[PDB]
Design a protein around this nucleic acid. Structure first.
Ligand SMILES: [Zn+2]
Ligand SMILES: [Zn+2]
Ligand SMILES: [Zn+2]
Ligand SMILES: [Zn+2]
Lengths: 199, 199, 199, 199
DNA sequence: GGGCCGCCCGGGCCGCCC
DNA sequence: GGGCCGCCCGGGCCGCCC
């Protein structure tokens, strides 16, 4: 079987969708999402709010998993990992393994997983329904390397795959978005959107 | 009996066909398929996505085998192997014999076979139906020598033969395409397509 | 005492001087020395010939040590080391510690030392007089990181300090030159020489 | 000490010089020497006559050694060897190790040596004075790879170093010349001589 | 917010076929 | 002897300094 997780959108029985904040485009804004590109632009280690929307509430014990894969076919097989420089940096929260690219901040029940067959990394939190009167549940992700990091992503674009799963790991829903971790998310979003409109 | 495997197209009971991505034509693109030539142009060791399409799902235990043979009659008899230089290069994935031209990346159940009678190499993975909502199953192949390699293919064109087989080795379907492994797949595809249109 | 080794030129009793080949200026030449800047421009891991000239022959047991220090006052204190990415690369010659920036190739008696007090790296070979009829002795050095390497030199210029020492470590002579390890030594030498002439 | 043998010309006590036949420049002549370049152009495995001239006769037991080194500083450290393809070719004379680039044909007392410290290859024959009435002693060398061989010389020019030595290995004399092993020695000699006269 | 170094890019330069 | 594929080449395109 393939060692590359599927990226196919699957809203599933609960109508699972992702939402992103309306952020702006100042040159070095910490995080900003492009709907035209379905692509998040963000700085290293900064908060990236991701909204979980459902049409109906999934059962208790539902989990939310985030995992990165390289976007290009030529690189899908390679596990996405932190580069050796940032791996050795003293910046662990005491829970996230230093090799993991994606973290979750502000959650008491975070789990960091290494797949036993594919060796891919992922980070898991329990699914929580929105507060009564709220439309969605917001998770704060962090990406611990720039897309450009030498010896790590090395300028290769990645996708983040968000899955809703039961406690057994069965797929309840799946969505994805592209990520660029860079120094100037506002400049780069504008550049990439202009290259899109030009072509 | 002939030691040269058949290349005859056979869609079979399950309507087996191959598909290829719409790739582009930049001078040194890593992989690009020419429908006019039914020919894949790719760089050494780079990802070559090949799509498996069926009209109906073959049974569990079905296998997908890929094998290379020289295209020209004068060379069909000779086993396709890596050249001595690349055979000795430390580029093994720990599974593929260093002599094998064709590898599969990103699959946990890959097998590398040497025919006991013909000594030809092949690489096998289990057939997997596409995800629900997907049209095909994609396999990532790698070719570990240039077509031009001295002491190996030595500028002789090859065919890749893809067979659908049951677990006993019975034939369920067969397709094939020409392969050129080269430094500049975009240049060489254009050159060969132009020579086709001129002739 | 200072943990920063002196860079002061000292020709000493034997008239110790350095010489460099007349190299050229093509964009990506592997190594080229600028007399205007007393600066070597070279590519990662490529041969850097350095000539040892003396007015008279030092005694047997003389050693030639090479050590790097950061040029700028702000960085002199920090030990010059390879970055984490290149430290983990499998490029060791079986002798050079993976942390050492400077190597010597083609010498059977090379030693790699870590100072017990300052922890600075250096590489040592025996001094050999030139062949009869030759004017100098040539050593081939290699620099195993780019000056720009993240987590290593990180765009900070270095000096290479070459010392002539007796077997006890007493100083017999000392010379030095600036080094930039970069992808395009010819481009960068021209750029820096033009900035010199303009200023 | 350096693992790179000296190439310095040393006529020595016996006035040791090399001579080469006047050959011509037909496109694919098997061997032709350029005095303007001090460079031999020859085809793979073909006879390359090399003349040994002395002003006076060296003692009995004198040996003649030929050894190849790469000409460019960047490659001097690497041992010159046959490529993996020609190494596996069944073309040994029963004496020459398949890895050795340089052979001697037509000599009953040929020795093939692998240096115990540098691992460099060489081929040795006894020195013989010319016949009475003859001016020189001619040795027939063969080069068993093209300069272009992938995984071997890989288009890097080499020097052949010819040394006169006593039975102990002491240096009595040394000369050298560049070698290009190629398919068309006449064409390539003319090309390289024209590039010389142009510049 | 303006603007200043590794790597990608298309042009074009040696064994073998004719 | 004429002439037809991997690799070298100079132009030019993302973190950090200002
Ligand atoms: Zn990083
Ligand atoms: Zn090969
Ligand atoms: Zn480095
Ligand atoms: Zn060869």
């Amino acid at each position: 079987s393939s060692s590359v997780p599927s990226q196919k959108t699957y809203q599933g029985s609960y109508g699972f969708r992702l939402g992103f904040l309306h952020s702006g485009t100042a040159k070095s804004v910490t995080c900003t999402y492009s709907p035209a590109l379905n692509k998040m632009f963000c700085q290293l280690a900064k908060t990236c709010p991701v909204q979980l929307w459902v049409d109906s509430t999934p059962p208790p014990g539902t989990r939310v998993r985030a995992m990165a894969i390289y976007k290009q076919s030529q690189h899908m097989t390679e596990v996405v990992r932190r580069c050796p420089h940032h791996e050795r940096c003293s910046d662990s929260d005491g829970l996230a393994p230093p090799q993991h690219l994606i973290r979750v901040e502000g959650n008491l029940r975070v789990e960091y997983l290494d797949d036993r067959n594919t060796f891919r990394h992922s980070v898991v939190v329990p699914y929580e329904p929105p507060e009564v009167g709220s439309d969605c549940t917001t998770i704060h992700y962090n990406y611990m390397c720039n897309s450009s990091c030498m010896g790590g992503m090395n300028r290769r674009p990645i996708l983040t795959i968000i899955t809703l799963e039961d406690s057994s790991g069965n797929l309840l829903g799946r969505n994805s978005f592209e990520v660029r971790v860079c120094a100037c998310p506002g400049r780069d979003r504008r550049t990439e959107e202009e290259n899109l409109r030009k072509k």
